[PDB]
Symmetry: C2
Subunit: 117 residues, 2 copies
Amino acid sequence: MSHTILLVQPTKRPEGRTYADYESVNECMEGVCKMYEEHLKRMNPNSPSITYDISQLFDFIDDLADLSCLVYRADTQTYQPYNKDWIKEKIYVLLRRQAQSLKVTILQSSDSRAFST
Amino acid sequence: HMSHTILLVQPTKRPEGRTYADYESVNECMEGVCKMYEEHLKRMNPNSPSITYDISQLFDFIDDLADLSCLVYRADTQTYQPYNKDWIKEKIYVLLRRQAQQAGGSLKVTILQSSDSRAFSTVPLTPV
């Protein structure tokens, strides 16, 4: 549970550079998936449940122009930098733990998640 | 110092306006804030070849910002160090004074809409 800032450059256009912050690494990592999930929720609005492989999640991330995060360390009172591929792993670790090839299904009816293998 | 610096901006309370830029050094990030205020003037005054602001005008415009922080890389820990709005304003106060030096009371900055470089002029007392 540490303050986490996320640097998102979606397209090569630098005016897209944006950021959000979260109370922990976890809801930052969930913040990324919720960015991809809102993208699928918007692509398929009439779909009640949208399923995606975790590879299409990483595919979306890979296509982002830039993604990085900054995690607070109370002992030094700074922010540690981790790059995109790091973030993808924490999302892999987060979604894998959430379940118990990974397949996530986006149940819009509940703003919740479900999994498969 | 001259380490990688990230600038976190937020003009209005509306978070969709959040953005960031990064710079090779702290001093190039501080100029980025000045240039952020400057171009806001140049766009407001497209018919004035030059515009001059007091440094305190640069500080009010920064208070208006919903949020403005910056992060400075630190090799000893390999981490980015946070700095709030006050720190940035003081760093700008110091940097522009040294830049005016090499060229109450307060400082006036004169920029040409053509250029990014600054011309400085010191003022006897500070405004109301």
